[PDB]
Amino acid sequence: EEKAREFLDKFNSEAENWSHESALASWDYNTNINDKNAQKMNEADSKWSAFYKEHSKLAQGFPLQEIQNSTIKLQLQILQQNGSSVLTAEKSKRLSTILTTMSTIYSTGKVCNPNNPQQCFTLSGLEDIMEKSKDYHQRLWIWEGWRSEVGKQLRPLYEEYVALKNEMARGNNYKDYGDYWRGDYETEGGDGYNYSRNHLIEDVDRIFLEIKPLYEQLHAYVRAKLMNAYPSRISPTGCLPAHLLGDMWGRFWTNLYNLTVPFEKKQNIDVTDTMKKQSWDAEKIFKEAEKFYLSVGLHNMTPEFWNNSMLTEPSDGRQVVCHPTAWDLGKNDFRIKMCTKVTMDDFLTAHHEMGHIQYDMAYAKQPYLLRNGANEGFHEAVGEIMSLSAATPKHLKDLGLLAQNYPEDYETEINFLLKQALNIVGTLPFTYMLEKWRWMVFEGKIPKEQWMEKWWEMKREIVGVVEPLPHDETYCDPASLFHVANDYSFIRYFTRTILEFQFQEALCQIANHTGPLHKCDISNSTEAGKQLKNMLELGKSKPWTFALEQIARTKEMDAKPLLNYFKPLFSWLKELNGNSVGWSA
Amino acid sequence: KLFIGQVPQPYEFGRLVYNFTKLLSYFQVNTFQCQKVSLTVDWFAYRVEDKSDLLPGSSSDLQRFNYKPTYCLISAYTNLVGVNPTNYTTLTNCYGCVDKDPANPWGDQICIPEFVTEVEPGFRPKPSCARVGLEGHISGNDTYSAIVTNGELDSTGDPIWRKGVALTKQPIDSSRADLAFFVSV
Ligand SMILES: *[C@@H]1O[C@H](CO)[C@@H](O[C@@H]2O[C@H](CO)[C@@H](O[C@@H]3O[C@H](CO)[C@@H](O)[C@H](O)[C@@H]3O)[C@H](O)[C@H]2NC(C)=O)[C@H](O)[C@H]1NC(C)=O
Ligand SMILES: *[C@@H]1O[C@H](CO)[C@@H](O[C@@H]2O[C@H](CO)[C@@H](O[C@@H]3O[C@H](CO)[C@@H](O)[C@H](O)[C@@H]3O)[C@H](O)[C@H]2NC(C)=O)[C@H](O)[C@H]1NC(C)=O
Ligand SMILES: *[C@@H]1O[C@H](CO)[C@@H](O[C@@H]2O[C@H](CO)[C@@H](O)[C@H](O)[C@H]2NC(C)=O)[C@H](O)[C@H]1NC(C)=O
Ligand SMILES: *[C@@H]1O[C@H](CO)[C@@H](O[C@@H]2O[C@H](CO)[C@@H](O)[C@H](O)[C@H]2NC(C)=O)[C@H](O)[C@H]1NC(C)=O
Ligand SMILES: *[C@@H]1O[C@H](CO)[C@@H](O[C@@H]2O[C@H](CO)[C@@H](O)[C@H](O)[C@H]2NC(C)=O)[C@H](O)[C@H]1NC(C)=O
Ligand SMILES: *[C@@H]1O[C@H](CO)[C@@H](O[C@@H]2O[C@H](CO)[C@@H](O)[C@H](O)[C@H]2NC(C)=O)[C@H](O)[C@H]1NC(C)=O
Ligand SMILES: *[C@@H]1O[C@H](CO)[C@@H](O)[C@H](O)[C@H]1NC(C)=O
Ligand SMILES: *[C@@H]1O[C@H](CO)[C@@H](O)[C@H](O)[C@H]1NC(C)=O
Ligand SMILES: *[C@@H]1O[C@H](CO)[C@@H](O)[C@H](O)[C@H]1NC(C)=O
Ligand SMILES: *[C@@H]1O[C@H](CO)[C@@H](O)[C@H](O)[C@H]1NC(C)=O
Ligand SMILES: [Zn+2]
């Protein structure tokens, strides 16, 4: 152990040094996109990778069987895992080529109008249409078009991809690549703080069943609404048409809100006009976000944060990517990159991204390799709960953004919950179903000959969505989604959503919140903040179930907090729908 | 003056804005407790047997839907002969409702138990909630439920509907009134 301890100590010191240089070069690129910064980024990343691999190989000299300290054992497990290298040179190179190819096919995909070949849109255009248009035919040829133009090109690549990733996983002592992806949750330890990979399946399956009753109410409701929007297209007891779900994949139903809004006459809360009247700007927005976190006993934003961060879109001719991201560069250097406008959407986003910085700061004291979230879904879960709080009527009133005498309209709260349900609940069946499908594909439960047969069978049974047109096995609809084509784990969105409400509810209980969870504001709750920090400061140095207990007082994922959040919507939907809840397949 | 005429129920508590010994010559106090101690008095009918619901920090329907003190409590009984209450009516619940059909603001309602309408300390129950209590006190159903609106409008100008539950209890001693008095400086 002592030799491994010295090894990791040396590694961690140098790793922060090299990682910092890598992060700096990447930052400079993203806030100033040109050839000079791109070159610095590529060189700094290369130096980092060479460093990491050098020590990864050296780490093989420290058997885990000789280690008693959990901190050392854990860091060695991270540096030691081979990952891709367990593969031979030919398969490693081939896999890289395939992954690059799938990404390229997706990003350069376009679909042309079959009745007007001269009218053709790129993915960005197609998304804009699928997220806006109310025309049955326009949405249909785009939905089918995307599957034909992109899905059919990725099909054969996804098949080879699955085979190669499974071999990679086996070379690392996993059953398959699905098992590899379920690795991030797995933890070891005494008492009830251990978590086998197989347990993740049991938890997500158990949770879905607990969520389902809520979703059936939302589904039947949306069905009833779309039946009027698209007359004679939808069966009263059947599944929803896949192309009429608000976007290209049916991932978020948010854009259906205009069609499914419970009480159209009632507007939601939007303080954009107030922020503009009061002359808010990017700096003020982030300063208010800081005040929020400080009120619960968390840390200051560093002088370096305010100086280095890019909170506004440059007017100096510099080209940037405005997509909001939080950065941790190491050496106590924290930054946010976000082209903030004076809107409610960016107001809430500023809170979201600063939440990520607060988490990154919390475990800054930890060993480099352990400087991450307890799991993949912990970072976004922390961000989202801060947004939920920031968006409440109560918080907005206290900030002077929402009129103090603004009435408590129950119709508005139903519209709010409905909109939130379309985004948060509607996506859960999708995420669950998608991962269930992929895991079964990697595991070998769903054979190539039944990939689409089971994809759509599962869509009807789990999500309640039906394919507008029948598909054979030359299709690969899952691959037409960004996260699938680009080899990302999608379960993080399922677990994040569940954890999001466990954290919010637990913090709301500590804060002594009474009434509906969707109106909970954890501002000025230093007790909840302390309980939160107790979890945040751990990074991934402890079993994530240990980290979970520190905040939610449980060692397992729990659906109840979500059901509680949307409980007022559930009751409304239930009485509105009566006995037409649910669907046939 | 507060002993002249009838006595209001918890959901419609009266408010009015001295010699304590003389007060004790009108009523017999069973519980006298003070918190952190022009004067304002909030008063309503309430049973002695369930007097525990008058004490701060207790979890009860009285302090949730009818009246929650903002921070001395005098729980006492007296014969007003004013007049004595026939019975005691307390809201056990109240929650927001929305219209089933958006095309008709006055039509069939869907009520949501989770949209709990809290009394809010120092505030009367919202008029939709108070109306339920007022009806329950006269309906004679031992527990009275109703979906009502009472002159309060939303951000558009449509009626605000609420559903409440008003539970009526019979006294053991029908010859006296049991009253709760909340006196603040
Ligand atoms: C978190 O706690 C802070 C205090 O540490 C709260 O800020 C304060 O908000 C109250 C109102 O809720 C302010 O008092 C009021 O000011 C207005 C004038 O704007 C006056 O008309 C009222 O009669 C009353 O005096 C108070 O001044 C203000 N404090 C500061 C330093 O701004 C904050 O709202 C809380 N956020 C919460 C509970 O969510
Ligand atoms: C609690 O005490 C109140 C009195 O303070 C009781 O209200 C009285 O209830 C009776 C019986 O329902 C009412 O008489 C009936 O009136 C209707 C007309 O609305 C008539 O059709 C019936 O034939 C009968 O005469 C009486 O009018 C009503 N008092 C008042 C002022 O309206 C209440 O019922 C008691 N609650 C319980 C649970 O005992
Ligand atoms: C849902 O309705 C809102 C309006 O209530 C739409 O937002 C407007 O869209 C038009 C057309 O692009 C803009 O000119 C307005 O400025 C937008 N208003 C606001 C407040 O942003 C929204 O696009 C509709 N959504 C869908 C899917 O149709
Ligand atoms: C990562 O790769 C190394 C090889 O570079 C693996 O180390 C071997 O492990 C086996 C036991 O399974 C030993 O018999 C070999 O002698 C080891 N070789 C070397 C060079 O150390 C290591 O086990 C792999 N990591 C994992 C988790 O499988
Ligand atoms: C934590 O580890 C314990 C074992 O120490 C696991 O309990 C076993 O679970 C398997 C599978 O259900 C059973 O067949 C064994 O009989 C159980 N053993 C004991 C002693 O109970 C436990 O499930 C693990 N916890 C998690 C979340 O994976
Ligand atoms: C949240 O509410 C609980 C009561 O429901 C509070 O707990 C009591 O707090 C007082 C001190 O304020 C103690 O004397 C009691 O013994 C506590 N009761 C129990 C059962 O714990 C709790 O302090 C409140 N939390 C906050 C942050 O206000
Ligand atoms: C593991 O090593 C760290 C030093 O990196 C030390 O602080 C910790 O107490 C050790 N834990 C055990 C169980 O020895
Ligand atoms: C945050 O910054 C403010 C302003 O300088 C300071 O008063 C406060 O103590 C700081 N809080 C923490 C936890 O550092
Ligand atoms: C921000 O940092 C740069 C670093 O070169 C410095 O030149 C600039 O003056 C700083 N701006 C401040 C401190 O407001
Ligand atoms: C009156 O009581 C009966 C019997 O419990 C009940 O069925 C009815 O709904 C009640 N009516 C009201 C207004 O509470
Ligand atoms: Zn995020």
Numbering used by the authors:
A (entry chain A): 23 to 607
B (entry chain B): 387 to 403, 409 to 428, 440 to 473, 478 to 487, 491 to 594
Task: Quote the original article.
However, the restrictive effect of this glycan is less pronounced on MOW15–22/PnNL2018B S1 binding to P.nat ACE2, underscoring possible differences in interactions with different ACE2s. Although viral propagation was not observed in Caco2 cells overexpressing hACE2, abrogation of the N432 glycan (via the N432C mutation) resulted in detectable amplification of pcVSV-MOW15–22-S. Furthermore, introducing the E589K or the Q287K/E589K mutations in the hACE2 N432C background further enhanced pcVSV-MOW15–22-S amplification efficiency and enabled detection of pcVSV-PnNL2018B-S amplification, concurring with our binding data. Despite the restriction on viral recognition imposed by the hACE2 N432 glycan, the two viruses could nevertheless utilize P.nat ACE2 harboring the C432N (glycan knockin) mutation, as demonstrated by observed viral propagation and S1 subunit binding. The phenotype indicates that these viruses can overcome the steric tropism barrier imposed by the N432 glycan, possibly through compensatory interactions in other ACE2 regions. However, the efficient amplification of pcVSV-MOW15–22-S and pcVSV-PnNL2018B-S supported by a P.nat ACE2 mutant (C432N) harboring an N432 glycan suggests putative evolutionary pathways by which these viruses could overcome this obstacle, underscoring the usefulness of the countermeasures identified here.
